[PDB]
Nucleic acid binder design. Sequence first.
RNA 1: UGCGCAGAUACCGGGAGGAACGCCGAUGGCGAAGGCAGCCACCUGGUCCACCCGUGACGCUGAGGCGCGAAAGCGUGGGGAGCAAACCGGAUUAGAUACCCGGGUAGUCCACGCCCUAAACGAUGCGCGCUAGGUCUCUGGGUCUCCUGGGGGCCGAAGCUAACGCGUUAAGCGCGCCGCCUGGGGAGUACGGCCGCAAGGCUGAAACUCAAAGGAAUUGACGGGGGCCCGCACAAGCGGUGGAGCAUGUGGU
Lengths: 70, 155, 116
Amino acid sequence: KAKVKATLGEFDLRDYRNVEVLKRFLSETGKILPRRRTGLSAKEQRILAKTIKRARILGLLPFTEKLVRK
Amino acid sequence: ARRRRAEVRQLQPDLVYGDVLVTAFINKIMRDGKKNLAARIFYDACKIIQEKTGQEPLKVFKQAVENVKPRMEVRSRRVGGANYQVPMEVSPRRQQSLALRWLVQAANQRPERRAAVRIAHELMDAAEGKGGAVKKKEDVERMAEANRAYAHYRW
Amino acid sequence: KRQVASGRAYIHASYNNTIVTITDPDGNPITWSSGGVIGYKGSRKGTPYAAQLAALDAAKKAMAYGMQSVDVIVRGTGAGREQAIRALQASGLQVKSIVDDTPVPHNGCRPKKKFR
RNA sequence: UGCGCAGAUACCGGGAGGAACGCCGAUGGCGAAGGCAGCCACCUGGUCCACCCGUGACGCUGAGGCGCGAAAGCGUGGGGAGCAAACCGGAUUAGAUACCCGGGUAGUCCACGCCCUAAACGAUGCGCGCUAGGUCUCUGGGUCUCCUGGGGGCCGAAGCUAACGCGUUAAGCGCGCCGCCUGGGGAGUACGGCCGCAAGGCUGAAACUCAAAGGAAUUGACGGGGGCCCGCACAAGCGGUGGAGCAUGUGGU
Ligand SMILES: [Mg+2]
Ligand SMILES: [Mg+2]
Ligand SMILES: [Mg+2]
Ligand SMILES: [Mg+2]
Ligand SMILES: [Mg+2]
Ligand SMILES: [Mg+2]
Ligand SMILES: [Mg+2]
Ligand SMILES: [Mg+2]
Ligand SMILES: [Mg+2]
Ligand SMILES: [Mg+2]
Ligand SMILES: [Mg+2]
Ligand SMILES: [Mg+2]
Ligand SMILES: [Mg+2]
Ligand SMILES: [Mg+2]
Ligand SMILES: [Mg+2]
Ligand SMILES: [Mg+2]
Ligand SMILES: [Mg+2]
Ligand SMILES: [Mg+2]
Ligand SMILES: [Mg+2]
Ligand SMILES: [Mg+2]
Ligand SMILES: [Mg+2]
Ligand SMILES: [Mg+2]
Ligand SMILES: [Mg+2]
Ligand SMILES: [Mg+2]
Ligand SMILES: [Mg+2]
Ligand SMILES: [Mg+2]
Ligand SMILES: [Mg+2]
Ligand SMILES: [Mg+2]
Ligand SMILES: [Mg+2]
Ligand SMILES: [Mg+2]
Ligand SMILES: [Mg+2]
Ligand SMILES: [Mg+2]
Ligand SMILES: [Mg+2]
Ligand SMILES: [Mg+2]
Ligand SMILES: [Mg+2]
Ligand SMILES: [Mg+2]
Ligand SMILES: [Mg+2]
Ligand SMILES: [Mg+2]
Ligand SMILES: [Mg+2]
Ligand SMILES: [Mg+2]
Ligand SMILES: [Mg+2]
Ligand SMILES: [Mg+2]
Ligand SMILES: [Mg+2]
Ligand SMILES: [Mg+2]
Ligand SMILES: [Mg+2]
Ligand SMILES: [Mg+2]
Ligand SMILES: [Mg+2]
Ligand SMILES: [Mg+2]
Ligand SMILES: [Mg+2]
């Protein structure tokens, strides 16, 4: 499987308002993908976590979703 | 059998019907090593069944056996304290042994006086679907589908 | 007496029981079944067989109200959580979709000693 | 046991309230220790790097003192969802003052004030200097296969250690300073003292008694430990014994 950073452009890791890019870093559910799947660095993931959470308080990214399978 | 598969014994074909199933049935009738007695019992019973009914005794032997074969049984398995009666299928080999054994043990519970009389009559009843053998088979198949709730313990 | 003909079927699957509710698309229930509704009483209620028979009882109870299309919601883990779904598929109800909505807290409430 | 026909469980919607922050999440980070996980803002401490700019030995340790100090517990006033000592039941059991199940008070949370213990652990005081490397990682800087600082890991040179192991994050080589040990039990007891509302803490003996107490490692036994594997050990199956009468041997008388 490819990683998210690999298939992506030059984006601002701090911009909490960009949903189009942040939604790429959530799972099927609303969870935050581990660095193994996001391809980010330790620092980069540390920043993404915060900006995703900020965006979740704004109603932009979800806290959790429902799994359609099984 | 802890090491190997314990291969099945290959019986000798029947001296009369050239058929192995018959030889095995004779073996289950035989007691105290009297195979001549058992064979004369079986064959005189073949005369009985072939006369009192005008059909070939071979086909009736096979049919009677076939109607006693159980397709499912129950086996205990030790699970978290007291064990459970757990249904599962029956090996074709085991269907064989069980059906023949049940046939003989049932025939000797018959009221008839002579051996070959009981053998013939039980063969006829079991081939028609009645008779004690078919009741042991129907009761075992009742053991499955009753404890069916444990179908996840298959093993 | 309702004629919904389409709705939701909720599979609540715990280790001690599996119970099925069947509702209209607005969530309001129609009929339901459970492990105790069919004959079983004790531990046998949490078995996958009882999950099958509960699912089927509730599906037949849905037929009389006209149900054909069903969306399946699933909450919980336990034996016969899958078996209840597989019974729901061959129940004659066409299964529209299947979702797992099992509620997990974000570490809010202290569990019983049993769950630590 | 409990709850449910006064309609529970399951499902949808609305509302209240308390507590804790899923994923990120790490073998990760920060802190002197205790300890610190949603998010935003304010106030605020430590720490690291680069420049080589300023002061000019201003340093290290540290008996007393003073401040901090998980949980539990104490006082007053709140609060009180979930859990839950004590306690009330239900089971289990030889018994069950327990493990399991249904409940439930303190408490767990807040404020303010007490208490000062701990497997408070790296069971390893602080500071400096010297002694091969290799590898993973967090975070700075650089002429950015790499080089160079500061943390966190794993192997391992020299060396040390009783051994396990330690090994530039020393348990190696040295130096300064503080704290502490001196056989097991009696005993963290007794007395006095200081402190505390209390519970209790800090200090801390003796008589008496014993030929031990202990550390690490070794072979072996054992495990209601693990992996693997045999035997009529189980299973599948056939015939028996246990019952009768008798033969015979033994116990008892
Ligand atoms: Mg149950
Ligand atoms: Mg599983
Ligand atoms: Mg836990
Ligand atoms: Mg009632
Ligand atoms: Mg009642
Ligand atoms: Mg009442
Ligand atoms: Mg609701
Ligand atoms: Mg509210
Ligand atoms: Mg209240
Ligand atoms: Mg985690
Ligand atoms: Mg200068
Ligand atoms: Mg000068
Ligand atoms: Mg100092
Ligand atoms: Mg001091
Ligand atoms: Mg304290
Ligand atoms: Mg406290
Ligand atoms: Mg209090
Ligand atoms: Mg109070
Ligand atoms: Mg409770
Ligand atoms: Mg309790
Ligand atoms: Mg009790
Ligand atoms: Mg009792
Ligand atoms: Mg006992
Ligand atoms: Mg600690
Ligand atoms: Mg020292
Ligand atoms: Mg200093
Ligand atoms: Mg290293
Ligand atoms: Mg760089
Ligand atoms: Mg640190
Ligand atoms: Mg280093
Ligand atoms: Mg050496
Ligand atoms: Mg080492
Ligand atoms: Mg050096
Ligand atoms: Mg050193
Ligand atoms: Mg040493
Ligand atoms: Mg002494
Ligand atoms: Mg003490
Ligand atoms: Mg004194
Ligand atoms: Mg005193
Ligand atoms: Mg006093
Ligand atoms: Mg007391
Ligand atoms: Mg030892
Ligand atoms: Mg062993
Ligand atoms: Mg045992
Ligand atoms: Mg034996
Ligand atoms: Mg046996
Ligand atoms: Mg005898
Ligand atoms: Mg009798
Ligand atoms: Mg006898």
